[PDB]
């Protein structure tokens, strides 16, 4: 819960997301609540391979499918991601956002930005599979607009979240290799101002 | 919301109402660089950072200025070193060079010169105190 504001989410995948007790702890949280945060956060941290090896592997999910279907994220976000279908994944964003993220007691503060990130990640992973793809070929059947699709992707460039090939006026769309000798050297640049912070700080009176 | 996102429309509405706050010491003169980043950072929010771009796609976001003067926007940032691009006069083909070969020879050496002098920086202070 404390990592939900920092948005680390990695240390909570094997602790908060992975629950040893099938039924909740009462005074801490709720049975439907502890099973809801496992699916929401698990899709952001655990990859698609770990979805079938962990989420459905745990017996806690099998008991939720045959009892409470009100979450709607078990038959929507899980199937659309496993099948890599963006056409069906788009309309389930708001339906889940309304019945999960809005009633959510933690992540309801910052929501729309958290959804827009995972919205492209489903399509970003599919981009690695195909080499050459036009703009209007399969995107017209996905039920989305071309203008709004480029607006969200255009703002992700300064965040260093796009190494790939995305084009609009022409429409030739390819994939790239984020592992190279550029980001390999980026580790040293990021540590430039963070390593010398405390070295020149306490070295005034002492040393 | 304006300078960092490179938006000219929301920048003019910010300077107009807050102009009273610009009457402080040297708070007006910093606006010269605030409106220049609208062009500089505006290139980054536009897809010009991507390789294959056409002018007809550029005129959409820059429509607030004009058509034929867009060639002056990209070319000005090329000499300064912000981004390199090639402009076509017919359809406005924009091919921007993306360098994946950097940080190989003499490029990291500028940073290596600093990492070498950090060892004896705090080490020589031990002999002093």
């Amino acid at each position: 819960i404390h990592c939900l504001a920092v948005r680390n989410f990695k240390e909570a995948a094997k602790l908060l997301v992975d629950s040893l007790a099938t039924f909740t702890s009462i005074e801490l949280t709720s049975y439907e609540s502890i099973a809801t945060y496992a699916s929401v956060t698990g899709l952001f941290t655990l990859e698609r391979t770990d979805l079938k090896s962990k989420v459905i592997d745990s017996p806690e999910l099998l008991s939720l499918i045959s009892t409470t279907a009100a979450l709607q994220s078990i038959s929507s976000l899980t199937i659309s991601l496993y099948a890599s279908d963006y056409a069906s994944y788009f309309p389930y964003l708001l339906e889940t956002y309304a019945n999960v993220l809005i009633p959510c007691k933690y992540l309801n503060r910052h929501a729309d930005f958290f959804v827009r990130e995972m919205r492209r990640k489903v399509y970003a992973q599919l981009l690695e599979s195909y080499k050459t793809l036009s703009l209007k070929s399969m995107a017209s059947a996905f039920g989305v607009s071309v203008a709004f699709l480029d607006n969200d992707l255009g703002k992700f460039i300064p965040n260093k979240q796009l190494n790939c090939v995305i084009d609009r006026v022409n429409g030739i769309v390819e994939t790239n290799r984020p592992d190279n000798k550029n980001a390999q050297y980026h580790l040293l640049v990021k540590q430039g101002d963070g390593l010398l912070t405390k070295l020149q700080k306490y070295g005034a009176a002492v040393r | 919301k304006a300078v960092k996102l490179g938006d000219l429309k929301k920048f003019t509405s910010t300077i107009t109402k807050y102009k009273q706050l610009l009457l402080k010491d040297d708070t007006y003169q910093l606006c010269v660089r605030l409106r220049s980043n609208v062009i500089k950072t505006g290139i980054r929010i536009i897809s010009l950072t991507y390789k294959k771009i056409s002018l007809r796609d550029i005129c959409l976001k820059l429509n607030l200025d004009s058509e034929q003067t867009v060639e002056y926007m990209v070319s000005r940032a090329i000499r300064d070193g912000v981004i390199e691009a090639k402009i076509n006069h017919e359809d406005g083909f924009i091919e921007t060079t993306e360098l994946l070969n950097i940080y190989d020879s003499e490029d990291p050496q500028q940073v290596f010169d600093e990492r070498i002098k950090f060892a004896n920086q705090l080490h020589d202070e031990y002999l002093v105190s």
Partner: peptide, 27 residues
């Protein structure tokens, strides 16, 4: 948290329902 976290345009709700209605009317 940078500006992207505190931005919250609240435009995700209207843009999702609009695109679904546009595709159904193109039939």
């Amino acid at each position: 948290e940078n500006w992207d976290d505190v931005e919250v345009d609240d435009d995700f709700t209207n843009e999702l329902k609009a695109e679904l209605d546009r595709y159904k009317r193109e039939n």
